[PDB]
Design a protein around this nucleic acid. Structure first.
Ligand SMILES: [Zn+2]
Ligand SMILES: [Zn+2]
Ligand SMILES: [Zn+2]
Ligand SMILES: [Zn+2]
Length: 119
DNA sequence: CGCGGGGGCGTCTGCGC
DNA sequence: GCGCAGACGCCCCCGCG
């Protein structure tokens, strides 16, 4: 509390005080995904928790699909969609079922969740 | 039924304050 | 030195031919 002082944070609803440099550094990373933003479009008022979410959201208004498939030339707006679509050519289906009479595999976690819902 | 496409979220890395 | 942002990865949910 004098010369020697603890670490602090500035984000809402946090403790705003930490005791370990790296523990606080890691803590700071947590809030980078919680920083409040709003849509920057001409006719929107939605909110986001990060620049990346807001930037992604802008793609829905702007039609910006820069992630073009090297094979299909199909333009996507997200890397996770492109990498997911990529597995279509890569035969990469790691999400195998665990039912007592199945071993069918999917390339998406939610596709496996869906499979189980139809099992 | 396989896959497109948007939401929210954690996170390493890099940059800027 | 820390904080924020930019960018990568996934889960989750919905809709379509
Ligand atoms: Zn904090
Ligand atoms: Zn918007
Ligand atoms: Zn393709
Ligand atoms: Zn199964």
């Amino acid at each position: 509390a004098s010369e020697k002082r603890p670490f602090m944070c500035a984000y809402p609803g946090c403790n705003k005080r930490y005791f370990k440099l790296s523990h606080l550094q890691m803590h700071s990373r947590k809030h980078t995904g919680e920083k409040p933003y709003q849509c920057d479009f001409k006719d929107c008022e939605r909110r986001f928790s990060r620049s990346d979410q807001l930037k992604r959201h802008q793609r829905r208004h702007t039609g910006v699909k820069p992630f073009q498939c090297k094979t299909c030339q199909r333009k996507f707006s997200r890397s996770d969609h492109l990498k997911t679509h990529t597995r279509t050519h890569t035969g990469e289906k790691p999400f195998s079922c665990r039912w007592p009479s199945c071993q069918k595999k999917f390339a998406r976690s939610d596709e496996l969740v869906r499979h189980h819902n139809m099992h």
